[PDB]
Amino acid sequence: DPGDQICIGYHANNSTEQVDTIMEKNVTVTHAQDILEKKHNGKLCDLDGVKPLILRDCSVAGWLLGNPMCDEFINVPEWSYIVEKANPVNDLCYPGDFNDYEELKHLLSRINHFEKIQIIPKSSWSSHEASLGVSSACPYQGKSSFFRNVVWLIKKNSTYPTIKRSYNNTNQEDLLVLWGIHHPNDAAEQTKLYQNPTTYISVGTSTLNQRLVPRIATRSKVNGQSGRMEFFWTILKPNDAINFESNGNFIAPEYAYKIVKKGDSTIMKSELEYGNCNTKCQTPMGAINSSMPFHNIHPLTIGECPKYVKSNRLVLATGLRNSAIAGFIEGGWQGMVDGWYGYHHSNEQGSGYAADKESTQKAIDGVTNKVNSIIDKMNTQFEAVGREFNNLERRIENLNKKMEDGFLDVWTYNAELLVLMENERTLDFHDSNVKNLYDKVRLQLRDNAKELGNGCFEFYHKCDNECMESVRNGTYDYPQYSEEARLKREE
Amino acid sequence: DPGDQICIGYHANNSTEQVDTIMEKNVTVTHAQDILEKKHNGKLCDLDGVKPLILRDCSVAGWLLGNPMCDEFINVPEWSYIVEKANPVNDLCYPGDFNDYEELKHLLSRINHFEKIQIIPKSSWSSHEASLGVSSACPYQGKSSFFRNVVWLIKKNSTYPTIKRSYNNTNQEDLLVLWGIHHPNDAAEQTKLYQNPTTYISVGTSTLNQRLVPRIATRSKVNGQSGRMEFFWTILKPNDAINFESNGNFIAPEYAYKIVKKGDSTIMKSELEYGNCNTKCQTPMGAINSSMPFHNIHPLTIGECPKYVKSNRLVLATGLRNSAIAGFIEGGWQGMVDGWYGYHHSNEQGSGYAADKESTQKAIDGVTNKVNSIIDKMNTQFEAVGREFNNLERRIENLNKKMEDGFLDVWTYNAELLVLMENERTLDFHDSNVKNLYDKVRLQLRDNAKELGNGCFEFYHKCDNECMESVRNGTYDYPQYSEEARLKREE
Amino acid sequence: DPGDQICIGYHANNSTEQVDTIMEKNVTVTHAQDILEKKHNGKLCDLDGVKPLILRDCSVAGWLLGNPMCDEFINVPEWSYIVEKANPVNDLCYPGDFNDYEELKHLLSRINHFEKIQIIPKSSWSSHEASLGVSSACPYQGKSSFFRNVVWLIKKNSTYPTIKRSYNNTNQEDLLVLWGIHHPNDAAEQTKLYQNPTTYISVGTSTLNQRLVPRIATRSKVNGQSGRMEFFWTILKPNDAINFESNGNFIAPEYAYKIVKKGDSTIMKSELEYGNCNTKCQTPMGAINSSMPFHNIHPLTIGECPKYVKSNRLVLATGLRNSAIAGFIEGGWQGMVDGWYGYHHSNEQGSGYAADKESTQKAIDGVTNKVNSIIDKMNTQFEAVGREFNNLERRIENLNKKMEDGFLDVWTYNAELLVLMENERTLDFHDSNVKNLYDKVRLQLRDNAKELGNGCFEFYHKCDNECMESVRNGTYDYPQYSEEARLKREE
Ligand SMILES: *[C@@H]1O[C@H](CO)[C@@H](O)[C@H](O)[C@H]1NC(C)=O
Ligand SMILES: *[C@@H]1O[C@H](CO)[C@@H](O)[C@H](O)[C@H]1NC(C)=O
Ligand SMILES: *[C@@H]1O[C@H](CO)[C@@H](O)[C@H](O)[C@H]1NC(C)=O
Ligand SMILES: *[C@@H]1O[C@H](CO)[C@@H](O)[C@H](O)[C@H]1NC(C)=O
Ligand SMILES: *[C@@H]1O[C@H](CO)[C@@H](O)[C@H](O)[C@H]1NC(C)=O
Ligand SMILES: *[C@@H]1O[C@H](CO)[C@@H](O)[C@H](O)[C@H]1NC(C)=O
Ligand SMILES: *[C@@H]1O[C@H](CO)[C@@H](O)[C@H](O)[C@H]1NC(C)=O
Ligand SMILES: *[C@@H]1O[C@H](CO)[C@@H](O)[C@H](O)[C@H]1NC(C)=O
Ligand SMILES: *[C@@H]1O[C@H](CO)[C@@H](O)[C@H](O)[C@H]1NC(C)=O
Ligand SMILES: *[C@@H]1O[C@H](CO)[C@@H](O)[C@H](O)[C@H]1NC(C)=O
Ligand SMILES: *[C@@H]1O[C@H](CO)[C@@H](O)[C@H](O)[C@H]1NC(C)=O
Ligand SMILES: *[C@@H]1O[C@H](CO)[C@@H](O)[C@H](O)[C@H]1NC(C)=O
């Protein structure tokens, strides 16, 4: 009238955070953690502390050959990736084609050292015209002009003597060398420009064995020209020489490029500002600080990135199902201001709440380990995802699409089910911890107290604050009170 | 003598449906659901409401050029995919080669609009022979003939003047244009056919810059010809012109094809009848209504398909382990005609079975949610799987095989373990629900009744049908009977 | 004083074997099994009972053409894969190129039958020089020499008549035929060697339609030659003929190769000894007997292999958490020398340990089934992983890298979490089995004994060894002792 009491119960709070499990939707929970990265900085950034190469309105081709309308950032000796606009304004001012263009973009995606040099001075042309090779297709300061890295040689007096030029690569580094051939409209143009009606370009290294022959066709005007310019490149290994021989139609090197190459990346299509940030993952829509194992921003990423996933939310339960003084069978305790599982007692020293420190620590460590495993076990490797295939490589681009789509389907499904399965395991862990605590107490107390059916025991003997602590400590001395208990019990 | 009784127990039935778990094989279960699609309709069907293109005995090449032995369905202005036989009877009647053939099949796999038109009338050949270009390799109505979409021009009198033809594309749509070159056997044939011993074909668009030259070799007879015909194509963008120039050996366009292209598919190898069905997934062996997330019919599918898996059965447990009146510790109740978990009682108003409505609904919703998650979380995207690589692309076909084989191994393993893990979780859920119901009752009754050890409680007081309902309702009033209970108990 | 007693408890031993779970690191456990293969035999071995082709210091090209410095194992009529060193010493002694080289290596990776034969005797050259075609680039026994499978024809007197040779393939098998063209340095060399200044090679089959033309360029010396030799191949189907015609610059077949092809493999880069072993999985670092579903040795494998994974350990718990006489609530029993779960009893016939045979068998079968599922459900297919793409195929090699890296990330993550999740399920199964055994006993004994709170019951009646067995058997007769129990109880 009335006896001393101890109750088992769990934490509750005012949280509205919701989570899904394999079996229940929209379960309200004490605390939750999102493992899906959804936030980008809306900028292009250095990658592992190396600037990109941003081509505002130029193609790689335009930029390499010196399309004179390409007003770009000139000096820039290394880069981690390249940014082009989808359809750049300035490409090949004089219409034509670039041989093995996509393989060269890929080779240039990421460069350790890049230094333009002069291999063949424009002034070294004594027996040909080095300053007439100019077109209204390639305008400079209003006047007709041409690509600035490469010379369109014309006949002098009425003569085009055979050209022979060797360049020996006396640098420490590989050289990227560029040249071209002119395909004219007809035999009149051919001889008006080069005198000789039948011409060739021959090029040789230790590797290269090339003979080019001009092609006449009747072609549509592009930039008001029916002619075409076709461009070619090689890498001249550090102790080799390249030997040019031509009769006509030769678009000669002036400037070449020293390059040092240490692994690849790709070409990103984006309209964004550079932003002086560093990052380990870049996206066409912005960079990411990538602690999380999953993201949903954009597929075409470069760096060490979370796995890309078709998903709005991946939320893990970390806390509990959120819902005298009755115990656990009736719901949670707002009064349990601290701890996850514990007690409410009432004796003659008064009443209150006490956390089970041991079982609460066990559980917080467990849930923290669960979240850290799901994050830390993720293998995260460098990759560069772009669209590097032209419109006669559609079968290979389709091969690339099945693979990308395949990994998206696998990661999306596996992340969704992983969250649903582990959410259900977590909520069931909390049920199992509460029920184990009740049994911890039931087994210590035996007949020295009575189960009230609501999560509480009423004692058959005076249990002061020290007896209470022994119960919470698992050190309750049953023999020391069996006598007193038995007397009140028999009655 | 004898006291009133309440028992906890679970549903049983006459089911022989078997399931596997991570720990036990061949467990008999109340109800189960297969998540592996195994049934096809044995037909080729429209795809998302668009007919295929079925080529009964023709190759794409034969069909485009008009091999005169190709007796196909003529009128057909759009299609979703193409069906060829493995080795079609009718290919190139006059032996030769088709330039970039596989890339063109891929481009034609799926077409929004397809309308043949005349660009160069057969009658517009005033100074050459338009009706002699005919071969016993290409038989029509018993008489010697040729491809019907393309003209084999021959010399007239003893003369082959230079041809110049422009066609300006004055249509709204892209044009697919086709032409060829004849490689003859020797210099006699060359001049017997074209008069001029040294010939070329030149072709120009805004894109194209082609010069073809015939090649003599000594070649084996094929369809009784040692000559070869080599074929070429381009897409003429809507405001461009194509310009032909030839000296000899020219196989001229007559008919070209207006095309509109909105995304790709592939070419399916199959021997099946069309069947007037629609579908969202087609297979070389039949279509599929694809609610399920997995199938085992065939890898080479087109559409939004289940994931392909090497597996005979993926069966999920949805029901229970299948096995006075004793309770749960002795097995299931055939008499529990309705509900999953519940009660059997006997008092002076009589005996019978009653379902625990609340815990049964909880569990049915849970299991239904589990099955719906495993199905609905599957990301399902359009894909087209074929064999599009020729016998000098074996390295790329091997790349495609590692990828396909890789996704099969991942999905097969993950589906098998997913079913085994969740089956074990489901059966353990049922054990946990039954044991919780027993404890729900044990905790309400306390000492007003005695545990019989078999899943039953014998009451120490008269419990009429209304007292019984309060127990099942969780509203049992212990104080209202503790008096009566205590008297029968002490004795 | 004192009463008979029965206790529930579990196996313990001196094991230090550690395991991780999703929630706890470094848990000590009774027994564990590694599912990660980490051991190789450091040798190259037959594959499914077929020898490899080991090229000690030769390239495939060198080996096919007969580079005279290639001192290899000569006779070898079938192989399962090819081994090259990274950069072989002996390649093309006379510098040049091999047309479609990588596709030919791939075709030759695995061969059912390989027999060299003579198609064109060196002696059958009556009107040309068959023994002058020799170079100081291609040294034999100190003297100048050449490739031994192929003849470098030179002019005789001062004449190079047109060559015409047919070879009809009168064998049962496909023929691999090899030829070349010589690109000389200048027009002097051209006529010094072949007399005729303007030359060609023409080659025809039912398939092939080739015309080769030599190319002059000014080229760097390689092996002290500025000339280049370019090589070509076809497969001559069993009833076809190949027809050669040349004017000059012809490197003629002498020997060709009968081949039978039944599926592909690849080319392995390795420095290892052959070792007379068989195997179903080979690695650049050694073979594997591949019972396990995962390995961490090397990615570039050939055969039916475990999945490659970035991981040091994948260890599964198979045993238990490892830790009067008190029962389970206080820890495990070293004395439980046999069985997993069971009993300790003490009556007047004496004390000791007894295994619960039924529940121990249930659990051992369960854990054995778990381990066997995780291993046996793995789909294991033939695959051949190499680096088959040249330095103008970098985009495709990058496509191959994303795919390989993608499957490594998926398998590594999924294996790690699979072990952590199932470890946690296994340890929780053991807790659940022990607690169920205690309740099995509590429910049989009811008030005929008292819970001591430590995992033990003290009986209220004499329980001899036969009464004890009925408890362990689940056949304990409560009525047969309720009388005796009640007397000692009331007191
Ligand atoms: C879950 O909650 C959201 C509201 O935030 C609601 O739109 C949704 O319909 C709820 N229920 C289910 C079953 O998804
Ligand atoms: C071209 O250059 C000068 C005339 O300015 C003359 O000496 C030379 O021979 C000229 N050649 C011809 C053939 O007109
Ligand atoms: C084709 O005709 C159109 C309309 O007459 C004209 O504008 C266009 O320039 C022509 N195309 C070419 C390249 O001549
Ligand atoms: C537990 O509680 C009792 C009573 O307060 C105290 O005397 C004892 O120091 C504690 N024992 C342990 C092992 O913490
Ligand atoms: C399971 O059941 C089938 C009979 O339907 C039988 O073939 C099989 O051997 C059984 N047992 C096991 C262990 O697979
Ligand atoms: C071919 O056509 C007619 C004869 O039918 C004649 O006028 C023409 O000049 C002929 N040409 C030759 C060179 O025979
Ligand atoms: C090769 O010889 C066979 C058998 O004599 C013959 O039937 C075949 O026609 C020949 N092949 C060619 C293309 O000449
Ligand atoms: C439960 O059962 C009792 C007894 O039949 C009934 O009076 C009461 O209406 C029910 N209570 C609830 C909350 O359903
Ligand atoms: C686990 O055990 C190893 C010693 O074998 C130790 O290096 C490691 O730090 C331990 N703890 C954790 C948290 O990894
Ligand atoms: C080459 O061979 C012999 C001389 O040994 C001679 O009969 C033949 O005509 C020679 N040809 C020439 C043109 O010198
Ligand atoms: C280039 O010059 C270097 C150094 O003078 C020389 O050794 C080398 O042979 C030259 N290369 C060629 C191929 O001439
Ligand atoms: C179990 O134990 C009792 C007592 O030893 C024995 O008589 C009986 O044969 C056993 N019963 C069964 C079903 O094994």
Short mmCIF file of C-alpha atoms and ligand atoms in Angstrom, two decimals, chain B residues 220-221, chain C residues 168-170 239-241, ligand 7:
data_model
loop_
_atom_site.label_atom_id
_atom_site.label_comp_id
_atom_site.label_asym_id
_atom_site.label_seq_id
_atom_site.Cartn_x
_atom_site.Cartn_y
_atom_site.Cartn_z
CA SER B 220 37.14 -17.34 -107.41
CA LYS B 221 33.66 -17.59 -109.07
CA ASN C 168 43.82 -24.42 -104.41
CA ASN C 169 43.16 -25.51 -100.77
CA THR C 170 42.82 -29.33 -101.25
CA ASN C 239 37.49 -25.51 -101.23
CA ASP C 240 38.64 -22.01 -102.32
CA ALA C 241 41.75 -20.80 -104.22
C1 LIG D 7 39.65 -26.14 -106.11
O1 LIG D 7 39.66 -27.52 -106.49
C2 LIG D 7 38.40 -28.16 -106.30
C3 LIG D 7 38.56 -29.66 -106.44
O2 LIG D 7 39.31 -29.94 -107.63
C4 LIG D 7 37.41 -27.58 -107.30
O3 LIG D 7 36.12 -28.19 -107.20
C5 LIG D 7 37.28 -26.11 -106.99
O4 LIG D 7 36.41 -25.47 -107.93
C6 LIG D 7 38.64 -25.42 -106.99
N1 LIG D 7 38.35 -24.09 -106.51
C7 LIG D 7 38.37 -23.06 -107.33
C8 LIG D 7 37.70 -21.82 -106.81
O5 LIG D 7 38.85 -23.15 -108.45
#
